[PDB]
């Protein structure tokens, strides 16, 4: 039994090994702790929106959506229908992005490394979609606490449809490379098994639950924007191992394509931010012709909107699991407290239990199957 | 509604068992993956010939900042300091005073481009479209100091990029 | 794509699917990068009459939380936080992958 220190996302890992078997595993985190939550308390709500792009930086608009939902719940307003449809469409696009990243980097760490390129081509196309809508490839800051910042340009839906009608074959090629390969099976099958009771007790959420057979999904049980309206299936595993989570994530990509099709077809007309110029800023023409609109633009961009006092916990089914925010407002234009609940924290906490009696080379596979991004883990 | 991903039962008749044994012994799925990679070799690569070819962008793209001016030649900025009040990263520093003709104009306008997070809040807070975040993204630098822009640098940026900045604003302003 | 017939047949055989039907590279089927101007309709509150803000003020309708069982001041059937969750249906599109 010897102690190894695998130092420098960036992760430090201290493990006690007896032979090849892992006897103890202890992750040391905080190498990416910037202090987002304390810095948020010095910014207004609009000023604090961009931090959530950086929190889980593979699924940006999902974090934006969770923050916006919390702020809207505290504001007692609701976004217009078209804003909700745009939010759900770009949330499913973001889910596709996150799942591609997770699966292909899992394979890369295992050693496959070809689907990484195959699917980062598609990831670049989706970044182009993000850029067209907001002017930024990844940190869009598009979804605001009153709706969305800007409307879609006149050719965006056509390009989204054109992209999304070929993506199924890309998933099929990924499956041809990975699903039935015996080396992939022997790397993933019966590795990192977690029971349903241990998954529930340890605070796991997302695929980590469904890989063990637990039937839970916040998009189905507690829908938030327009999720109840759209129909999709929730993939459920049977063994609680890495292979089942792989299969769940691929099927989630397919169901995300299904929801994207539905969202493309059922886009409604109308405005994109709540018609309340004390929360959402007025248009530039109104601001340059109306006195009330100019006053409201001035005050919203200098001071911000005051949020009624109260504390809320808002959660969404982000690609990596339940992403939540505990937001405490004192009645002013700056949040009093903003605690962020990231599923990566709980999953990395459970890594020690999940890597019991496995080889040193399986810790890599377990970390990959947890889908750990250390921006959300450390904050 | 829910689906099962791994709830399949292998058939135990002799033909299925022989198929599984032949797959184990002759490596059929391995050859099929080889075929997938081989087919993928014979299709056109997605690489572009940078710097002779460029990645597509949008009129909404955020890039190097600029200070615009009216057609007459007078700068648009009036030192209202809304861009400085809204900046999430506190990258803007502004100082103003009455000009020699009583005009409300800045005497200091600094952007620390190593603090900026390129969110575009500054250009959407400005009521006179003075500060914009223009199309340029190739402005990498050999020293830390050249990334601390002052008023002269931003005005030169505006006068340098005005044609394309105005064209992009014309293309996009009806969405704002 | 400018791929010869022999190379196309070879790649479709090696892959096992029809590749020209779903290509990875974007061609003239995409939308133009220069578009007509939009009109962008206005919201529901752009009325001229019957539009007082005191009737559409969401923030001012928020209330402090209702205090129940302040310790500072019947059959009684047992109750649960919410009715028990219904079982999910087995996806009559592909119940089994």
């Amino acid at each position: 039994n010897l102690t190894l220190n695998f130092g420098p996302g960036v992760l430090r890992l201290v493990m006690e090994l007896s032979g090849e078997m892992v006897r103890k595993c202890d992750p040391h985190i905080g190498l990416l702790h910037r202090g987002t939550e304390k810095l948020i308390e010095y910014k207004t709500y609009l000023q604090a929106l961009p931090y959530f792009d950086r929190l889980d930086y593979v699924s940006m608009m999902c974090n934006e959506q969770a923050y916006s939902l919390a702020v809207e719940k505290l504001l007692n307003i609701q976004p217009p229908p078209r804003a909700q449809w745009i939010r759900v469409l770009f949330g499913e696009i973001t889910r596709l992005l996150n799942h591609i990243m997770a699966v292909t980097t899992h394979a890369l760490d295992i050693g496959a490394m070809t689907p990484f390129f195959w699917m980062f081509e598609e990831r670049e196309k989706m970044f182009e979609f993000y850029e067209r809508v907001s002017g930024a490839r990844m940190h869009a800051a598009y979804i605001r606490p009153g709706g969305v910042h800007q409307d879609l340009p006149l050719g965006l839906l056509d390009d989204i449809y054109e992209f999304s009608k070929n993506f199924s074959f890309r998933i099929d090629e990924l499956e041809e490379m990975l699903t039935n390969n015996r080396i992939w099976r022997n790397r993933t099958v019966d590795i990192g098994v977690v029971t349903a009771e241990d998954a529930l007790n340890y605070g796991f959420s997302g695929v980590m639950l469904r890989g063990s057979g637990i039937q839970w999904d916040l998009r189905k049980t507690q829908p938030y924007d327009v999720y109840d309206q759209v129909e999709f299936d929730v993939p459920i595993g049977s063994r609680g191992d890495c292979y089942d989570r792989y299969l769940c994530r691929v099927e989630e990509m397919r169901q995300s394509l299904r929801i994207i099709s539905q969202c493309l077809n059922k886009m409604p007309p109308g405005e994109i931010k709540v018609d309340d110029a004390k929360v959402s800023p007025p248009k530039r023409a109104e601001m340059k012709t109306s006195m009330e609109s100019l006053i409201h633009h001035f005050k919203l961009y200098t001071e911000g909107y005051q949020v009624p006092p109260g504390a809320t916990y808002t959660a969404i089914e982000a690609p990596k699991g339940e992403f939540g925010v505990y937001l405490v407002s004192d009645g002013s234009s700056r949040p009093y407290r903003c605690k962020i609940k990231a599923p990566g924290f709980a999953h990395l906490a459970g890594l020690d239990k999940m890597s019991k009696g496995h080889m040193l080379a399986d810790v890599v596979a377990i970390i990959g199957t947890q889908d750990i991004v250390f921006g959300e883990v450390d904050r | 509604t829910y689906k099962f991903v791994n709830m399949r039962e292998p058939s135990m008749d002799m033909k299925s068992v022989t198929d599984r044994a032949a797959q184990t012994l002759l490596w059929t799925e391995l050859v099929r993956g080889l075929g997938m990679t081989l087919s993928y070799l014979f299709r056109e690569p997605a690489t572009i010939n940078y710097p002779f070819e460029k990645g597509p962008l949008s009129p909404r793209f955020r890039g190097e900042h600029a200070l615009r001016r009216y057609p007459s030649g007078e700068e648009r900025c009036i030192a209202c300091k809304l861009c400085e009040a809204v900046c999430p990263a506190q990258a803007i520093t502004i100082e103003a005073e009455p000009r020699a003709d009583g005009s409300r104009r800045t005497t200091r306008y600094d952007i620390d481009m190593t603090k900026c997070i390129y969110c575009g809040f500054c250009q959407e807070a400005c009521p006179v479209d003075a500060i914009v975040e223009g199309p340029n993204f190739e402005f990498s630098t050999e020293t830390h100091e050249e990334l601390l822009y002052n008023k002269e640098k931003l005005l030169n940026n505006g006068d340098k990029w005005e044609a394309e900045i105005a064209a992009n604003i014309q293309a996009d302003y009806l969405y704002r | 794509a400018s791929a010869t017939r022999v190379i196309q047949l070879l790649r479709n055989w090696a892959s096992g699917r029809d590749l020209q039907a779903k290509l990875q590279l974007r061609y003239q089927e995409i939308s133009k990068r220069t578009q007509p101007p939009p009109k962008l309709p206005v919201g529901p509150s752009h009325k001229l009459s019957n539009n007082y803000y005191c009737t559409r003020d969401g923030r001012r309708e928020a209330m402090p939380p209702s205090i129940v069982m302040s310790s500072q001041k019947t059959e009684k059937k047992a109750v649960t936080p919410a009715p028990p969750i219904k079982r999910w249906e087995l996806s009559k599109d592909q119940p089994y992958l």
Binding site: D151, L152, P153, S168, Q255 | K15 | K39
Partner: peptide, 29 residues
Amino acid sequence: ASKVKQDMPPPGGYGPIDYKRNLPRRGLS
């Protein structure tokens, strides 16, 4: 004068999108 013009799906919607898993069996006993 002019009417509303924004990004909307075309009349009749878009064509169907394939999402089902498609891994054909090459075929040999």
